[PDB]
């Protein structure tokens, strides 16, 4: 689709289902996340979701979370057919913003191809168990998890604009 | 053009010139930044760039910068016909990254180019006052906008991808 169309309704609602992007479609999303300067990706799908679920749940448990949070951790991976874990290896604010630039690009690449992506990154991102699951070293850091799949069904800047008249 | 080529084969725009986005085109860009804390946008153009230039230069001076740095600060606003100052009200600094990316794409989609700049001057008391920043306000940076003056490219994720399961 044309870049112009990418400025559509932007009604990114929840509920992502199959089909999940595959082959080049998925490669295109990853590529887009890469070109946004001015990263290690983990593909979680199918049976892999089971494992991820177990890891998140153990993470929540070790973190002393409550039943509801624990159950939410276990059920998380099944909210989309595909999940991409973004791990990073240059000030703080720099990487912080670069991460956001990359994530937004990935979500746009998914949309452009008829898919959708929901970004997630809670406290479990810092859980020793979860970090270990993705082989995170001391310097390594889990940025977050991008849920992908096929989606299932006006902003006013004016109140926020001022002119530097001079 | 193609959104995918725009995202993948971006080929960063080099140098911006007239015309700059105006009216709704600009509103379109700002609206894009709002869609994935309330941001405050400052529109700097024409005469405003000269005022912005004096503010930046003073900041460099107040910081005891050398002439090279002082010259760079004074000259900065003239590298594009339009500049948008993004002020946030204090997903951390990641939301900023998402908004700026969206705005750049919104500009590039309409044939414009957007170059993001920050620098230590966003922290300067002089610069913060010029934009009326309070203790709860933080200048995120400046988005330079104009018509790109200025090419294929395709990254390979493979060495950067591993299957979990």
Short mmCIF file of C-alpha atoms in Angstrom, two decimals:
data_model
loop_
_atom_site.label_atom_id
_atom_site.label_comp_id
_atom_site.label_asym_id
_atom_site.label_seq_id
_atom_site.Cartn_x
_atom_site.Cartn_y
_atom_site.Cartn_z
CA UNK A 1 0.00 0.00 0.00
CA UNK A 2 1.04 3.61 -0.48
CA UNK A 3 2.65 5.38 2.48
CA UNK A 4 -0.29 7.79 2.30
CA UNK A 5 -2.74 4.98 3.00
CA UNK A 6 -0.70 4.14 6.09
CA UNK A 7 -2.20 7.33 7.57
CA UNK A 8 -5.60 5.61 7.61
CA UNK A 9 -8.08 5.28 10.50
CA UNK A 10 -5.27 3.97 12.72
CA UNK A 11 -7.92 2.19 14.80
CA UNK A 12 -5.40 -0.38 16.05
CA UNK A 13 -7.78 -2.48 18.14
CA UNK A 14 -6.90 -5.60 20.14
CA UNK A 15 -7.67 -9.20 19.18
CA UNK A 16 -4.95 -10.53 16.88
CA UNK A 17 -5.50 -13.94 15.27
CA UNK A 18 -4.23 -16.17 12.48
CA UNK A 19 -2.78 -15.93 9.97
CA UNK A 20 0.46 -14.63 11.47
CA UNK A 21 2.91 -12.97 9.08
CA UNK A 22 5.37 -15.47 7.63
CA UNK A 23 8.24 -15.65 5.17
CA UNK A 24 9.15 -12.32 3.62
CA UNK A 25 6.17 -10.59 5.24
CA UNK A 26 7.71 -11.29 8.65
CA UNK A 27 11.22 -10.49 7.38
CA UNK A 28 9.92 -7.12 6.19
CA UNK A 29 8.65 -6.26 9.66
CA UNK A 30 12.03 -7.11 11.20
CA UNK A 31 13.87 -5.14 8.50
CA UNK A 32 11.80 -2.06 9.26
CA UNK A 33 12.59 -2.33 12.94
CA UNK A 34 16.27 -2.38 12.02
CA UNK A 35 16.32 0.75 9.86
CA UNK A 36 15.56 3.52 12.34
CA UNK A 37 18.86 4.94 13.70
CA UNK A 38 19.85 8.59 13.25
CA UNK A 39 19.16 -5.98 18.03
CA UNK A 40 18.39 -9.66 18.55
CA UNK A 41 14.95 -10.95 17.59
CA UNK A 42 13.30 -14.09 18.96
CA UNK A 43 10.46 -15.64 16.93
CA UNK A 44 7.84 -17.18 19.20
CA UNK A 45 5.12 -19.19 17.46
CA UNK A 46 3.23 -22.46 17.72
CA UNK A 47 4.57 -24.76 20.42
CA UNK A 48 7.08 -22.04 21.31
CA UNK A 49 4.17 -20.13 22.84
CA UNK A 50 3.78 -22.93 25.40
CA UNK A 51 7.34 -22.46 26.61
CA UNK A 52 7.11 -18.66 26.63
CA UNK A 53 3.94 -19.03 28.69
CA UNK A 54 5.75 -21.23 31.21
CA UNK A 55 8.65 -18.78 31.40
CA UNK A 56 6.40 -15.77 31.93
CA UNK A 57 4.40 -17.60 34.59
CA UNK A 58 7.53 -18.71 36.46
CA UNK A 59 8.73 -15.14 36.17
CA UNK A 60 5.56 -13.78 37.71
CA UNK A 61 5.70 -16.39 40.47
CA UNK A 62 9.32 -15.64 41.38
CA UNK A 63 8.42 -11.93 41.42
CA UNK A 64 5.82 -12.57 44.11
CA UNK A 65 2.93 -11.47 41.88
CA UNK A 66 -0.66 -12.27 42.81
CA UNK A 67 -2.82 -15.04 41.35
CA UNK A 68 -4.48 -12.75 38.81
CA UNK A 69 -1.11 -11.45 37.60
CA UNK A 70 0.28 -14.99 37.47
CA UNK A 71 -2.66 -16.22 35.38
CA UNK A 72 -2.35 -13.19 33.13
CA UNK A 73 1.31 -14.01 32.60
CA UNK A 74 0.49 -17.60 31.61
CA UNK A 75 -2.31 -16.59 29.23
CA UNK A 76 -0.39 -13.75 27.55
CA UNK A 77 1.38 -15.70 24.71
CA UNK A 78 -1.95 -16.95 23.37
CA UNK A 79 -3.30 -13.48 22.61
CA UNK A 80 -1.62 -13.55 19.18
CA UNK A 81 -0.29 -16.36 16.89
CA UNK A 82 3.13 -14.73 16.72
CA UNK A 83 5.30 -12.86 19.22
CA UNK A 84 8.67 -11.24 18.57
CA UNK A 85 10.91 -10.65 21.60
CA UNK A 86 13.22 -7.65 21.03
CA UNK A 87 16.51 -7.86 22.92
CA UNK A 88 19.21 -5.19 22.98
CA UNK A 89 22.92 -5.38 23.81
CA UNK A 90 25.13 5.55 23.67
CA UNK A 91 23.26 7.29 26.53
CA UNK A 92 20.08 6.06 28.23
CA UNK A 93 17.62 8.40 26.51
CA UNK A 94 19.21 7.46 23.19
CA UNK A 95 18.54 3.72 23.17
CA UNK A 96 15.19 4.39 24.83
CA UNK A 97 13.99 6.49 21.91
CA UNK A 98 15.68 4.37 19.23
CA UNK A 99 13.69 1.44 20.59
CA UNK A 100 10.45 3.36 20.15
CA UNK A 101 11.37 4.46 16.63
CA UNK A 102 12.03 0.81 15.71
CA UNK A 103 8.87 -0.55 17.32
CA UNK A 104 6.64 2.00 15.58
CA UNK A 105 8.30 1.10 12.28
CA UNK A 106 7.66 -2.61 12.83
CA UNK A 107 3.99 -1.97 13.57
CA UNK A 108 3.71 0.10 10.38
CA UNK A 109 5.38 -2.63 8.31
CA UNK A 110 2.85 -5.12 9.70
CA UNK A 111 -0.07 -2.82 8.85
CA UNK A 112 1.26 -2.14 5.37
CA UNK A 113 1.02 -5.88 4.77
CA UNK A 114 -2.44 -6.38 6.27
CA UNK A 115 -1.27 -7.47 9.69
CA UNK A 116 -1.26 -5.92 13.12
CA UNK A 117 1.03 -5.70 16.09
CA UNK A 118 0.53 -4.92 19.76
CA UNK A 119 3.56 -3.89 21.78
CA UNK A 120 4.03 -5.18 25.33
CA UNK A 121 6.77 -4.67 27.92
CA UNK A 122 5.98 -4.97 31.62
CA UNK A 123 8.05 -5.65 34.74
CA UNK A 124 8.53 -9.30 33.70
CA UNK A 125 10.86 -7.85 31.10
CA UNK A 126 13.34 -7.51 33.98
CA UNK A 127 12.66 -10.93 35.54
CA UNK A 128 15.81 -13.05 35.96
CA UNK A 129 13.93 -16.16 34.77
CA UNK A 130 12.63 -14.46 31.62
CA UNK A 131 15.99 -12.78 30.89
CA UNK A 132 17.68 -16.17 31.31
CA UNK A 133 15.17 -17.75 28.93
CA UNK A 134 16.37 -15.41 26.19
CA UNK A 135 20.04 -15.67 27.11
CA UNK A 136 20.45 -12.15 28.46
CA UNK A 137 23.94 -11.24 29.68
CA UNK A 138 24.61 -8.42 32.15
CA UNK A 139 24.61 -5.81 29.37
CA UNK A 140 21.72 -7.47 27.54
CA UNK A 141 18.23 -6.12 27.99
CA UNK A 142 14.80 -7.33 26.92
CA UNK A 143 13.15 -4.37 25.26
CA UNK A 144 9.73 -5.92 24.94
CA UNK A 145 7.45 -8.27 23.06
CA UNK A 146 5.68 -7.51 19.81
CA UNK A 147 2.49 -9.53 19.35
CA UNK A 148 1.58 -10.09 15.70
CA UNK A 149 -1.29 -11.59 13.77
CA UNK A 150 -4.32 -10.71 11.66
CA UNK A 151 -6.53 -8.01 13.19
CA UNK A 152 -10.07 -8.88 14.29
CA UNK A 153 -12.22 -5.81 13.57
CA UNK A 154 -10.28 12.50 15.32
CA UNK A 155 -7.07 13.55 17.14
CA UNK A 156 -6.89 17.31 17.61
CA UNK A 157 -3.35 18.75 17.97
CA UNK A 158 -4.72 22.29 18.06
CA UNK A 159 -4.99 22.30 21.88
CA UNK A 160 -1.30 21.33 21.78
CA UNK A 161 0.13 23.81 19.24
CA UNK A 162 1.92 27.13 19.77
CA UNK A 163 3.73 29.32 17.25
CA UNK A 164 7.20 30.70 18.03
CA UNK A 165 6.16 34.09 16.60
CA UNK A 166 9.27 36.07 17.59
CA UNK B 1 5.25 5.79 -2.71
CA UNK B 2 5.25 2.29 -1.22
CA UNK B 3 5.02 2.25 2.59
CA UNK B 4 7.26 -0.81 2.75
CA UNK B 5 9.97 0.83 0.64
CA UNK B 6 9.53 3.91 2.82
CA UNK B 7 10.11 1.88 6.00
CA UNK B 8 12.75 -0.52 4.71
CA UNK B 9 14.57 1.36 1.96
CA UNK B 10 14.30 4.72 3.70
CA UNK B 11 17.59 6.22 2.52
CA UNK B 12 17.63 9.08 5.04
CA UNK B 13 16.89 12.43 3.42
CA UNK B 14 19.92 14.70 3.26
CA UNK B 15 19.26 18.43 3.60
CA UNK B 16 15.83 20.05 3.56
CA UNK B 17 14.63 23.11 1.65
CA UNK B 18 11.53 25.02 0.64
CA UNK B 19 8.71 24.32 0.56
CA UNK B 20 7.94 23.21 4.11
CA UNK B 21 4.68 21.60 5.21
CA UNK B 22 1.91 24.13 5.83
CA UNK B 23 -1.71 24.18 6.93
CA UNK B 24 -3.26 20.73 7.05
CA UNK B 25 -0.10 18.97 5.89
CA UNK B 26 1.54 20.12 9.13
CA UNK B 27 -1.59 19.25 11.10
CA UNK B 28 -1.45 15.81 9.49
CA UNK B 29 2.12 15.34 10.73
CA UNK B 30 1.33 16.50 14.28
CA UNK B 31 -1.80 14.36 14.40
CA UNK B 32 0.36 11.37 13.48
CA UNK B 33 2.58 11.98 16.48
CA UNK B 34 -0.41 12.02 18.83
CA UNK B 35 -1.58 8.60 17.64
CA UNK B 36 0.84 6.14 19.28
CA UNK B 37 1.18 12.21 28.22
CA UNK B 38 -0.11 15.21 26.18
CA UNK B 39 2.60 16.64 23.90
CA UNK B 40 3.05 20.36 23.30
CA UNK B 41 4.19 21.41 19.82
CA UNK B 42 5.92 24.66 18.92
CA UNK B 43 5.87 25.73 15.28
CA UNK B 44 9.01 27.57 14.25
CA UNK B 45 9.28 29.16 10.80
CA UNK B 46 10.07 32.38 8.96
CA UNK B 47 10.92 35.04 11.55
CA UNK B 48 10.56 32.56 14.40
CA UNK B 49 13.67 30.75 13.21
CA UNK B 50 15.72 33.89 13.83
CA UNK B 51 14.34 34.13 17.36
CA UNK B 52 14.95 30.39 17.84
CA UNK B 53 18.48 30.92 16.51
CA UNK B 54 19.19 33.62 19.10
CA UNK B 55 17.81 31.38 21.85
CA UNK B 56 20.03 28.47 20.83
CA UNK B 57 23.13 30.66 20.52
CA UNK B 58 22.56 32.18 23.95
CA UNK B 59 22.23 28.70 25.39
CA UNK B 60 25.58 27.71 23.92
CA UNK B 61 27.08 30.93 25.28
CA UNK B 62 25.59 30.45 28.75
CA UNK B 63 27.14 26.95 28.66
CA UNK B 64 30.61 28.36 27.99
CA UNK B 65 30.81 26.66 24.60
CA UNK B 66 33.61 27.43 22.15
CA UNK B 67 32.95 29.47 18.99
CA UNK B 68 32.51 26.37 16.83
CA UNK B 69 29.72 25.16 19.10
CA UNK B 70 28.29 28.69 19.32
CA UNK B 71 28.27 29.01 15.53
CA UNK B 72 26.60 25.61 15.13
CA UNK B 73 23.87 26.61 17.57
CA UNK B 74 23.13 29.94 15.83
CA UNK B 75 23.12 28.30 12.37
CA UNK B 76 21.00 25.25 13.33
CA UNK B 77 17.52 26.66 12.64
CA UNK B 78 18.39 27.52 9.03
CA UNK B 79 19.04 23.91 7.98
CA UNK B 80 15.30 23.58 7.30
CA UNK B 81 12.40 25.97 6.50
CA UNK B 82 10.32 24.58 9.35
CA UNK B 83 11.16 23.24 12.81
CA UNK B 84 8.85 21.66 15.36
CA UNK B 85 9.82 21.68 19.02
CA UNK B 86 8.35 18.72 20.87
CA UNK B 87 7.69 19.30 24.58
CA UNK B 88 6.54 16.47 26.83
CA UNK B 89 4.77 16.77 30.18
CA UNK B 90 6.49 14.81 32.97
CA UNK B 91 7.33 3.07 27.34
CA UNK B 92 9.52 5.57 29.21
CA UNK B 93 11.25 7.78 26.64
CA UNK B 94 10.15 5.10 24.19
CA UNK B 95 6.81 6.82 23.54
CA UNK B 96 8.76 9.78 22.21
CA UNK B 97 10.52 7.47 19.75
CA UNK B 98 7.18 6.11 18.53
CA UNK B 99 5.72 9.60 18.03
CA UNK B 100 8.74 10.98 16.16
CA UNK B 101 8.80 7.93 13.87
CA UNK B 102 5.10 8.37 13.08
CA UNK B 103 5.60 12.09 12.33
CA UNK B 104 8.57 11.45 10.01
CA UNK B 105 6.58 8.88 8.06
CA UNK B 106 3.68 11.33 7.87
CA UNK B 107 6.04 13.94 6.43
CA UNK B 108 7.81 11.56 4.03
CA UNK B 109 4.46 10.22 2.82
CA UNK B 110 3.47 13.72 1.63
CA UNK B 111 6.81 14.20 -0.10
CA UNK B 112 8.54 16.02 2.75
CA UNK B 113 11.52 15.00 4.79
CA UNK B 114 11.98 15.11 8.53
CA UNK B 115 15.26 15.21 10.40
CA UNK B 116 15.27 14.70 14.16
CA UNK B 117 17.79 16.55 16.31
CA UNK B 118 18.18 16.87 20.06
CA UNK B 119 21.47 17.80 21.68
CA UNK B 120 22.43 19.05 25.12
CA UNK B 121 20.76 22.38 24.38
CA UNK B 122 17.32 20.85 24.96
CA UNK B 123 18.43 20.79 28.63
CA UNK B 124 19.65 24.42 28.71
CA UNK B 125 17.85 26.72 31.17
CA UNK B 126 17.92 29.43 28.48
CA UNK B 127 16.26 27.23 25.85
CA UNK B 128 13.73 25.81 28.33
CA UNK B 129 12.66 29.31 29.33
CA UNK B 130 12.20 30.37 25.71
CA UNK B 131 9.63 27.59 25.39
CA UNK B 132 8.22 28.32 28.84
CA UNK B 133 9.15 24.94 30.31
CA UNK B 134 8.13 24.30 33.88
CA UNK B 135 9.44 21.66 36.26
CA UNK B 136 6.94 19.25 34.66
CA UNK B 137 8.03 20.07 31.10
CA UNK B 138 10.82 18.54 29.07
CA UNK B 139 11.97 19.51 25.58
CA UNK B 140 12.26 16.18 23.75
CA UNK B 141 13.86 17.58 20.65
CA UNK B 142 13.37 19.33 17.34
CA UNK B 143 11.97 17.90 14.14
CA UNK B 144 13.34 19.71 11.08
CA UNK B 145 10.88 19.68 8.15
CA UNK B 146 11.12 20.61 4.48
CA UNK B 147 11.47 19.20 0.97
CA UNK B 148 14.29 16.63 0.74
CA UNK B 149 17.23 17.55 -1.49
CA UNK B 150 19.09 14.27 -1.34
CA UNK B 151 18.09 4.90 -3.03
CA UNK B 152 17.58 1.14 -2.60
CA UNK B 153 18.73 -0.80 0.48
CA UNK B 154 17.59 -4.00 2.22
CA UNK B 155 18.83 -5.13 5.67
CA UNK B 156 19.21 -8.80 6.56
CA UNK B 157 17.68 -9.81 9.92
CA UNK B 158 18.71 -13.49 9.65
CA UNK B 159 21.92 -13.16 11.70
CA UNK B 160 19.75 -11.26 14.19
CA UNK B 161 16.88 -13.77 14.35
CA UNK B 162 16.49 -16.93 16.42
CA UNK B 163 13.48 -19.20 16.82
CA UNK B 164 12.36 -19.72 20.42
CA UNK B 165 10.22 -22.88 20.68
#
